[PDB]
Amino acid sequence: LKQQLQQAEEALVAKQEVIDKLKEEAEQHKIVMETVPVLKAQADIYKADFQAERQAREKLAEKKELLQEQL
Amino acid sequence: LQQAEEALVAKQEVIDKLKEEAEQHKIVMETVPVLKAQADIYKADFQAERQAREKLAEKKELL
C-alpha cells in the first residue's frame, strides 16, 4: 500500500529538479535581456561619435584640399 | 497521496509557466548578437574616422 507515496515522492522531487532546472536557468535569461538597452546606447553613441568624426574631416578637407590649390 | 497528487498537477503548472515565459525571453536574445555587431562596426567606423580625422590634421602644418 506504499507504492504511491513512494512513486509520487520520487516524481515530486524529480519535478523539483526541473522547476530548479528552469528556475536559475531563468535568472540567466534575465541578465541578457538587460544588456539590450545598454547595447543600443553603445551603438548610438558610437554612431554619434562617428558622425562627429565624419563631419570633422569634411570640414578639414575643405580647408586643406584648398591649400594645395594655393602653394 | 492527496498532498502529492496535488503537486503533480500543481508543479506541472509552474513548469508550464516557466515553459512559455522562457520561449519569450528567447526572442530578444536572438537579436543581442546583431546588436553587438552594430556596436562593433560603429566603434570601428568611428575609430577609422578618429584616426583618418587625425592623419588629415597632419597636413595642416604643411599647408
From the list A19, A29, A57, the residue facing B14 with the nearest CB is: A19
Contact list in A for residue B43 (CB cut-off 8 A) is: 42, 46
C-alpha to C-alpha distance for A24 and B62, rounded to whole angstroms: 63
Name residue B60's amino acid. Answer: K
Q: What is the nearest CA distance from A24 to chain B, expressed in angstroms? A: 11
Q: Under a CB-based contact definition with an 8 Å cutoff, are residues B12 and A15 in contact?
A: yes
Name residue A69's amino acid. Answer: E
Contact list in B for residue A36 (CB cut-off 8 A) is: 28, 31-32, 35
Contact A15 B25 (CB under 8 A): no
Entry resolution (Å): 3.2
Please report, for chain A, the start and end positions of each structural domain, with discontinuous segments joined by +: 1-71
Q: Domain A1-71: which topology?
A: 1.20.5
Name residue A28's amino acid. Answer: Q
Contact B5 A8 (CB under 8 A): yes
3-state SS class at B33: helix
C-alpha to C-alpha distance for A23 and B54, rounded to whole angstroms: 52
C-alpha to C-alpha distance for B56 and B54, rounded to whole angstroms: 5
Which residues make Cβ contacts (< 8 Å) with residue B31, sequence separation at least 6? Answer: A36
Which residues make Cβ contacts (< 8 Å) with residue B60, sequence separation at least 6? Answer: A60, A63, A64
Q: Which residue, chain included where needed, has cell 528567447?
A: B26
C-alpha to C-alpha distance for A37 and A34, rounded to whole angstroms: 6
Radius of gyration, CA atoms only, chain A: 31
From the list A8, A54, A68, the residue facing B63 with the nearest CB is: A68
The CATH superfamily holding the domain B1-63 is Nemo cc2-lz domain - 1d5 darpin complex (1.20.5.990)
